Amino acid sequence: AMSMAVESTGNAKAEAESRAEAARIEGEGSVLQAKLKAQALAIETEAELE
Amino acid sequence: AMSMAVESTGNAKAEAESRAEAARIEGEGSVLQAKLKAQALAIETEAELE
């Protein structure tokens, strides 16, 4: 029972923490792309404003 | 009866605690993605506001 508990919790935590790490990387990437796209829109619409 | 009790409770607790650990990792991941996506929206809509 102890061995099954540790194996099952390791198997679940691996597939859960890989997803969590990938989601963290995607969140940081998404906010950085949000900054870059914000600059892109704020300059495109500013020039098109003129 | 004692052996069956311990085996059944170990087998149930393994499949229950793996799910609980995976759900905890998913919750932490989800809140971190919520922060990152919150920053992404708060900058995208801010630039699009301009």
mmCIF file of N, CA and C in Angstrom:
data_model
loop_
_atom_site.group_PDB
_atom_site.id
_atom_site.type_symbol
_atom_site.label_atom_id
_atom_site.label_comp_id
_atom_site.label_asym_id
_atom_site.label_seq_id
_atom_site.Cartn_x
_atom_site.Cartn_y
_atom_site.Cartn_z
ATOM 1 N N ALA A 1 0.824 -1.201 0.000
ATOM 2 C CA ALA A 1 0.000 0.000 0.000
ATOM 3 C C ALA A 1 0.860 1.254 0.000
ATOM 4 N N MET A 2 1.928 1.270 0.802
ATOM 5 C CA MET A 2 2.831 2.417 0.790
ATOM 6 C C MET A 2 3.493 2.586 -0.574
ATOM 7 N N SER A 3 3.937 1.478 -1.172
ATOM 8 C CA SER A 3 4.584 1.534 -2.479
ATOM 9 C C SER A 3 3.613 2.011 -3.552
ATOM 10 N N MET A 4 2.381 1.502 -3.526
ATOM 11 C CA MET A 4 1.373 1.942 -4.482
ATOM 12 C C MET A 4 1.038 3.412 -4.282
ATOM 13 N N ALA A 5 0.957 3.857 -3.027
ATOM 14 C CA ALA A 5 0.675 5.261 -2.755
ATOM 15 C C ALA A 5 1.765 6.155 -3.324
ATOM 16 N N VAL A 6 3.029 5.822 -3.055
ATOM 17 C CA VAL A 6 4.106 6.680 -3.535
ATOM 18 C C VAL A 6 4.208 6.622 -5.057
ATOM 19 N N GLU A 7 4.030 5.443 -5.658
ATOM 20 C CA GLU A 7 4.081 5.339 -7.112
ATOM 21 C C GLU A 7 2.953 6.120 -7.773
ATOM 22 N N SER A 8 1.728 5.983 -7.263
ATOM 23 C CA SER A 8 0.595 6.674 -7.862
ATOM 24 C C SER A 8 0.708 8.181 -7.677
ATOM 25 N N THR A 9 1.125 8.633 -6.490
ATOM 26 C CA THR A 9 1.282 10.067 -6.291
ATOM 27 C C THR A 9 2.422 10.633 -7.126
ATOM 28 N N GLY A 10 3.505 9.882 -7.328
ATOM 29 C CA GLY A 10 4.562 10.332 -8.207
ATOM 30 C C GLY A 10 4.111 10.413 -9.650
ATOM 31 N N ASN A 11 3.392 9.387 -10.112
ATOM 32 C CA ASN A 11 2.891 9.383 -11.480
ATOM 33 C C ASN A 11 1.900 10.509 -11.733
ATOM 34 N N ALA A 12 1.012 10.788 -10.781
ATOM 35 C CA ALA A 12 0.074 11.896 -10.905
ATOM 36 C C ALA A 12 0.752 13.254 -10.811
ATOM 37 N N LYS A 13 1.651 13.437 -9.842
ATOM 38 C CA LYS A 13 2.367 14.692 -9.684
ATOM 39 C C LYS A 13 3.278 14.996 -10.860
ATOM 40 N N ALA A 14 3.870 13.988 -11.498
ATOM 41 C CA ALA A 14 4.674 14.229 -12.688
ATOM 42 C C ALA A 14 3.840 14.813 -13.822
ATOM 43 N N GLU A 15 2.735 14.147 -14.162
ATOM 44 C CA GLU A 15 1.867 14.600 -15.239
ATOM 45 C C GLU A 15 1.133 15.886 -14.893
ATOM 46 N N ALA A 16 1.005 16.214 -13.609
ATOM 47 C CA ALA A 16 0.394 17.465 -13.191
ATOM 48 C C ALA A 16 1.380 18.625 -13.159
ATOM 49 N N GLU A 17 2.602 18.403 -12.685
ATOM 50 C CA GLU A 17 3.632 19.425 -12.594
ATOM 51 C C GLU A 17 4.277 19.740 -13.929
ATOM 52 N N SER A 18 4.378 18.767 -14.839
ATOM 53 C CA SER A 18 4.791 19.095 -16.197
ATOM 54 C C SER A 18 3.798 20.050 -16.841
ATOM 55 N N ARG A 19 2.503 19.778 -16.669
ATOM 56 C CA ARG A 19 1.476 20.674 -17.184
ATOM 57 C C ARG A 19 1.563 22.044 -16.525
ATOM 58 N N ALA A 20 1.780 22.081 -15.209
ATOM 59 C CA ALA A 20 1.915 23.347 -14.497
ATOM 60 C C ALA A 20 3.122 24.158 -14.953
ATOM 61 N N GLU A 21 4.280 23.526 -15.139
ATOM 62 C CA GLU A 21 5.470 24.202 -15.635
ATOM 63 C C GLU A 21 5.278 24.710 -17.059
ATOM 64 N N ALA A 22 4.684 23.884 -17.925
ATOM 65 C CA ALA A 22 4.400 24.327 -19.284
ATOM 66 C C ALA A 22 3.443 25.509 -19.280
ATOM 67 N N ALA A 23 2.438 25.477 -18.404
ATOM 68 C CA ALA A 23 1.489 26.580 -18.318
ATOM 69 C C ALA A 23 2.146 27.841 -17.773
ATOM 70 N N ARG A 24 3.081 27.698 -16.830
ATOM 71 C CA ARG A 24 3.817 28.859 -16.337
ATOM 72 C C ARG A 24 4.650 29.485 -17.449
ATOM 73 N N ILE A 25 5.339 28.648 -18.227
ATOM 74 C CA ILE A 25 6.131 29.160 -19.340
ATOM 75 C C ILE A 25 5.229 29.835 -20.366
ATOM 76 N N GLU A 26 4.078 29.227 -20.664
ATOM 77 C CA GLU A 26 3.114 29.846 -21.564
ATOM 78 C C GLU A 26 2.560 31.153 -21.022
ATOM 79 N N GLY A 27 2.352 31.268 -19.715
ATOM 80 C CA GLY A 27 1.891 32.515 -19.141
ATOM 81 C C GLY A 27 2.913 33.627 -19.255
ATOM 82 N N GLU A 28 4.174 33.314 -18.944
ATOM 83 C CA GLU A 28 5.229 34.312 -19.103
ATOM 84 C C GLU A 28 5.392 34.711 -20.566
ATOM 85 N N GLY A 29 5.386 33.729 -21.464
ATOM 86 C CA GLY A 29 5.437 34.007 -22.880
ATOM 87 C C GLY A 29 4.270 34.859 -23.318
ATOM 88 N N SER A 30 3.070 34.539 -22.829
ATOM 89 C CA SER A 30 1.871 35.260 -23.228
ATOM 90 C C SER A 30 1.910 36.704 -22.767
ATOM 91 N N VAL A 31 2.374 36.954 -21.540
ATOM 92 C CA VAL A 31 2.465 38.338 -21.087
ATOM 93 C C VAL A 31 3.545 39.100 -21.852
ATOM 94 N N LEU A 32 4.656 38.449 -22.202
ATOM 95 C CA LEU A 32 5.662 39.142 -22.999
ATOM 96 C C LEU A 32 5.171 39.439 -24.417
ATOM 97 N N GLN A 33 4.481 38.484 -25.049
ATOM 98 C CA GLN A 33 3.848 38.759 -26.336
ATOM 99 C C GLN A 33 2.773 39.822 -26.206
ATOM 100 N N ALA A 34 2.080 39.873 -25.069
ATOM 101 C CA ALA A 34 1.107 40.925 -24.831
ATOM 102 C C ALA A 34 1.755 42.295 -24.789
ATOM 103 N N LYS A 35 2.893 42.429 -24.113
ATOM 104 C CA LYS A 35 3.666 43.666 -24.165
ATOM 105 C C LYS A 35 4.119 44.016 -25.578
ATOM 106 N N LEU A 36 4.668 43.045 -26.310
ATOM 107 C CA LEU A 36 5.185 43.326 -27.647
ATOM 108 C C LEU A 36 4.062 43.709 -28.607
ATOM 109 N N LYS A 37 2.958 42.961 -28.586
ATOM 110 C CA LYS A 37 1.781 43.279 -29.380
ATOM 111 C C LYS A 37 1.130 44.582 -28.950
ATOM 112 N N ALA A 38 1.176 44.918 -27.661
ATOM 113 C CA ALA A 38 0.685 46.210 -27.207
ATOM 114 C C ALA A 38 1.494 47.341 -27.818
ATOM 115 N N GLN A 39 2.821 47.204 -27.827
ATOM 116 C CA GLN A 39 3.660 48.197 -28.494
ATOM 117 C C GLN A 39 3.343 48.265 -29.985
ATOM 118 N N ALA A 40 3.171 47.101 -30.616
ATOM 119 C CA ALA A 40 2.884 47.061 -32.047
ATOM 120 C C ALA A 40 1.580 47.774 -32.377
ATOM 121 N N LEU A 41 0.523 47.506 -31.608
ATOM 122 C CA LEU A 41 -0.752 48.178 -31.837
ATOM 123 C C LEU A 41 -0.659 49.665 -31.519
ATOM 124 N N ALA A 42 -0.005 50.017 -30.410
ATOM 125 C CA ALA A 42 0.111 51.408 -30.002
ATOM 126 C C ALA A 42 0.930 52.241 -30.969
ATOM 127 N N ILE A 43 1.797 51.627 -31.771
ATOM 128 C CA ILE A 43 2.489 52.355 -32.826
ATOM 129 C C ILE A 43 1.765 52.279 -34.169
ATOM 130 N N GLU A 44 1.151 51.142 -34.510
ATOM 131 C CA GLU A 44 0.411 51.021 -35.759
ATOM 132 C C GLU A 44 -0.773 51.976 -35.793
ATOM 133 N N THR A 45 -1.588 51.975 -34.740
ATOM 134 C CA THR A 45 -2.745 52.852 -34.666
ATOM 135 C C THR A 45 -2.352 54.314 -34.497
ATOM 136 N N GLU A 46 -1.207 54.589 -33.874
ATOM 137 C CA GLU A 46 -0.689 55.945 -33.761
ATOM 138 C C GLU A 46 -0.268 56.510 -35.110
ATOM 139 N N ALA A 47 0.442 55.721 -35.916
ATOM 140 C CA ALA A 47 0.798 56.168 -37.257
ATOM 141 C C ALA A 47 -0.437 56.265 -38.144
ATOM 142 N N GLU A 48 -1.322 55.267 -38.060
ATOM 143 C CA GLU A 48 -2.565 55.309 -38.821
ATOM 144 C C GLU A 48 -3.465 56.436 -38.335
ATOM 145 N N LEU A 49 -3.315 56.843 -37.071
ATOM 146 C CA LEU A 49 -4.026 58.021 -36.589
ATOM 147 C C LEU A 49 -3.616 59.259 -37.373
ATOM 148 N N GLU A 50 -2.312 59.440 -37.586
ATOM 149 C CA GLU A 50 -1.841 60.526 -38.437
ATOM 150 C C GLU A 50 -2.294 60.321 -39.877
ATOM 151 N N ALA B 1 -9.371 -10.686 6.978
ATOM 152 C CA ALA B 1 -10.139 -9.448 6.983
ATOM 153 C C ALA B 1 -9.233 -8.242 7.178
ATOM 154 N N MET B 2 -8.263 -8.341 8.092
ATOM 155 C CA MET B 2 -7.318 -7.242 8.272
ATOM 156 C C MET B 2 -6.498 -7.007 7.007
ATOM 157 N N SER B 3 -6.035 -8.087 6.375
ATOM 158 C CA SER B 3 -5.242 -7.966 5.156
ATOM 159 C C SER B 3 -6.063 -7.362 4.024
ATOM 160 N N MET B 4 -7.311 -7.809 3.873
ATOM 161 C CA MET B 4 -8.183 -7.247 2.850
ATOM 162 C C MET B 4 -8.477 -5.782 3.128
ATOM 163 N N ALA B 5 -8.682 -5.428 4.398
ATOM 164 C CA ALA B 5 -8.934 -4.037 4.749
ATOM 165 C C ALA B 5 -7.751 -3.159 4.377
ATOM 166 N N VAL B 6 -6.539 -3.575 4.757
ATOM 167 C CA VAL B 6 -5.381 -2.737 4.468
ATOM 168 C C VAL B 6 -5.109 -2.687 2.968
ATOM 169 N N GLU B 7 -5.266 -3.809 2.258
ATOM 170 C CA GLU B 7 -5.053 -3.805 0.816
ATOM 171 C C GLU B 7 -6.064 -2.921 0.099
ATOM 172 N N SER B 8 -7.345 -3.033 0.457
ATOM 173 C CA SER B 8 -8.373 -2.243 -0.206
ATOM 174 C C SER B 8 -8.218 -0.763 0.110
ATOM 175 N N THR B 9 -7.921 -0.421 1.369
ATOM 176 C CA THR B 9 -7.728 0.984 1.698
ATOM 177 C C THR B 9 -6.477 1.552 1.041
ATOM 178 N N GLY B 10 -5.412 0.765 0.901
ATOM 179 C CA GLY B 10 -4.243 1.226 0.183
ATOM 180 C C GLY B 10 -4.522 1.437 -1.289
ATOM 181 N N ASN B 11 -5.226 0.485 -1.909
ATOM 182 C CA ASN B 11 -5.567 0.609 -3.320
ATOM 183 C C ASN B 11 -6.476 1.798 -3.590
ATOM 184 N N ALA B 12 -7.454 2.052 -2.723
ATOM 185 C CA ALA B 12 -8.324 3.211 -2.862
ATOM 186 C C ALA B 12 -7.605 4.523 -2.585
ATOM 187 N N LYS B 13 -6.816 4.586 -1.510
ATOM 188 C CA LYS B 13 -6.071 5.788 -1.174
ATOM 189 C C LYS B 13 -5.020 6.133 -2.215
ATOM 190 N N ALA B 14 -4.401 5.147 -2.861
ATOM 191 C CA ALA B 14 -3.457 5.436 -3.933
ATOM 192 C C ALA B 14 -4.131 6.144 -5.101
ATOM 193 N N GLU B 15 -5.218 5.561 -5.614
ATOM 194 C CA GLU B 15 -5.937 6.138 -6.740
ATOM 195 C C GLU B 15 -6.652 7.429 -6.376
ATOM 196 N N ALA B 16 -6.911 7.667 -5.091
ATOM 197 C CA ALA B 16 -7.513 8.912 -4.645
ATOM 198 C C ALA B 16 -6.490 10.014 -4.412
ATOM 199 N N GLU B 17 -5.340 9.697 -3.824
ATOM 200 C CA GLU B 17 -4.285 10.656 -3.539
ATOM 201 C C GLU B 17 -3.480 11.036 -4.766
ATOM 202 N N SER B 18 -3.317 10.130 -5.733
ATOM 203 C CA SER B 18 -2.738 10.538 -7.006
ATOM 204 C C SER B 18 -3.610 11.588 -7.678
ATOM 205 N N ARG B 19 -4.926 11.369 -7.672
ATOM 206 C CA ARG B 19 -5.849 12.352 -8.225
ATOM 207 C C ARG B 19 -5.782 13.662 -7.452
ATOM 208 N N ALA B 20 -5.715 13.590 -6.121
ATOM 209 C CA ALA B 20 -5.609 14.791 -5.301
ATOM 210 C C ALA B 20 -4.325 15.571 -5.553
ATOM 211 N N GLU B 21 -3.182 14.897 -5.661
ATOM 212 C CA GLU B 21 -1.914 15.548 -5.966
ATOM 213 C C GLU B 21 -1.922 16.171 -7.358
ATOM 214 N N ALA B 22 -2.446 15.443 -8.348
ATOM 215 C CA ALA B 22 -2.555 16.000 -9.690
ATOM 216 C C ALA B 22 -3.456 17.225 -9.697
ATOM 217 N N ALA B 23 -4.555 17.178 -8.943
ATOM 218 C CA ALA B 23 -5.461 18.317 -8.874
ATOM 219 C C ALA B 23 -4.818 19.500 -8.161
ATOM 220 N N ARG B 24 -4.005 19.239 -7.136
ATOM 221 C CA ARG B 24 -3.282 20.322 -6.473
ATOM 222 C C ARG B 24 -2.301 20.987 -7.432
ATOM 223 N N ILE B 25 -1.564 20.176 -8.194
ATOM 224 C CA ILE B 25 -0.629 20.730 -9.167
ATOM 225 C C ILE B 25 -1.379 21.524 -10.229
ATOM 226 N N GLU B 26 -2.513 20.999 -10.701
ATOM 227 C CA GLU B 26 -3.342 21.731 -11.649
ATOM 228 C C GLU B 26 -3.897 23.019 -11.069
ATOM 229 N N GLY B 27 -4.249 23.046 -9.789
ATOM 230 C CA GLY B 27 -4.721 24.270 -9.171
ATOM 231 C C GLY B 27 -3.646 25.333 -9.081
ATOM 232 N N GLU B 28 -2.443 24.935 -8.659
ATOM 233 C CA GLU B 28 -1.336 25.889 -8.620
ATOM 234 C C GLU B 28 -0.991 26.386 -10.020
ATOM 235 N N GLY B 29 -0.935 25.476 -10.988
ATOM 236 C CA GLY B 29 -0.711 25.856 -12.364
ATOM 237 C C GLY B 29 -1.785 26.796 -12.859
ATOM 238 N N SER B 30 -3.044 26.501 -12.532
ATOM 239 C CA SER B 30 -4.159 27.308 -13.004
ATOM 240 C C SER B 30 -4.113 28.713 -12.426
ATOM 241 N N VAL B 31 -3.781 28.845 -11.139
ATOM 242 C CA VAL B 31 -3.684 30.186 -10.569
ATOM 243 C C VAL B 31 -2.494 30.947 -11.147
ATOM 244 N N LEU B 32 -1.379 30.269 -11.423
ATOM 245 C CA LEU B 32 -0.260 30.968 -12.047
ATOM 246 C C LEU B 32 -0.573 31.394 -13.482
ATOM 247 N N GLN B 33 -1.226 30.524 -14.260
ATOM 248 C CA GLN B 33 -1.696 30.928 -15.583
ATOM 249 C C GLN B 33 -2.734 32.031 -15.488
ATOM 250 N N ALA B 34 -3.549 32.031 -14.435
ATOM 251 C CA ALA B 34 -4.498 33.109 -14.222
ATOM 252 C C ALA B 34 -3.803 34.439 -13.999
ATOM 253 N N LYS B 35 -2.744 34.464 -13.193
ATOM 254 C CA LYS B 35 -1.919 35.660 -13.060
ATOM 255 C C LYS B 35 -1.294 36.092 -14.382
ATOM 256 N N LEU B 36 -0.706 35.152 -15.124
ATOM 257 C CA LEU B 36 -0.029 35.506 -16.369
ATOM 258 C C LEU B 36 -1.018 36.016 -17.414
ATOM 259 N N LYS B 37 -2.147 35.326 -17.574
ATOM 260 C CA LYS B 37 -3.212 35.760 -18.466
ATOM 261 C C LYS B 37 -3.852 37.059 -18.008
ATOM 262 N N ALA B 38 -3.940 37.294 -16.698
ATOM 263 C CA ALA B 38 -4.425 38.572 -16.200
ATOM 264 C C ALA B 38 -3.505 39.704 -16.625
ATOM 265 N N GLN B 39 -2.193 39.502 -16.498
ATOM 266 C CA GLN B 39 -1.242 40.498 -16.987
ATOM 267 C C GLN B 39 -1.384 40.692 -18.493
ATOM 268 N N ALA B 40 -1.531 39.589 -19.232
ATOM 269 C CA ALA B 40 -1.654 39.671 -20.684
ATOM 270 C C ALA B 40 -2.882 40.471 -21.098
ATOM 271 N N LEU B 41 -4.030 40.200 -20.475
ATOM 272 C CA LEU B 41 -5.242 40.952 -20.787
ATOM 273 C C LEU B 41 -5.124 42.404 -20.344
ATOM 274 N N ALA B 42 -4.587 42.638 -19.145
ATOM 275 C CA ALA B 42 -4.460 43.988 -18.617
ATOM 276 C C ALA B 42 -3.501 44.848 -19.419
ATOM 277 N N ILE B 43 -2.574 44.252 -20.165
ATOM 278 C CA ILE B 43 -1.736 45.021 -21.075
ATOM 279 C C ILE B 43 -2.305 45.083 -22.492
ATOM 280 N N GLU B 44 -2.923 44.006 -22.990
ATOM 281 C CA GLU B 44 -3.520 44.017 -24.318
ATOM 282 C C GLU B 44 -4.652 45.029 -24.406
ATOM 283 N N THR B 45 -5.581 44.991 -23.453
ATOM 284 C CA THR B 45 -6.702 45.918 -23.438
ATOM 285 C C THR B 45 -6.269 47.342 -23.110
ATOM 286 N N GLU B 46 -5.193 47.510 -22.344
ATOM 287 C CA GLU B 46 -4.634 48.827 -22.066
ATOM 288 C C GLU B 46 -4.040 49.469 -23.311
ATOM 289 N N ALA B 47 -3.276 48.707 -24.094
ATOM 290 C CA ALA B 47 -2.750 49.236 -25.348
ATOM 291 C C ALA B 47 -3.872 49.460 -26.354
ATOM 292 N N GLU B 48 -4.801 48.505 -26.450
ATOM 293 C CA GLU B 48 -5.946 48.666 -27.337
ATOM 294 C C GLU B 48 -6.848 49.797 -26.866
ATOM 295 N N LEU B 49 -6.826 50.101 -25.564
ATOM 296 C CA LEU B 49 -7.539 51.274 -25.071
ATOM 297 C C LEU B 49 -6.990 52.545 -25.703
ATOM 298 N N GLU B 50 -5.663 52.675 -25.756
ATOM 299 C CA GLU B 50 -5.053 53.798 -26.460
ATOM 300 C C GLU B 50 -5.346 53.724 -27.953
#
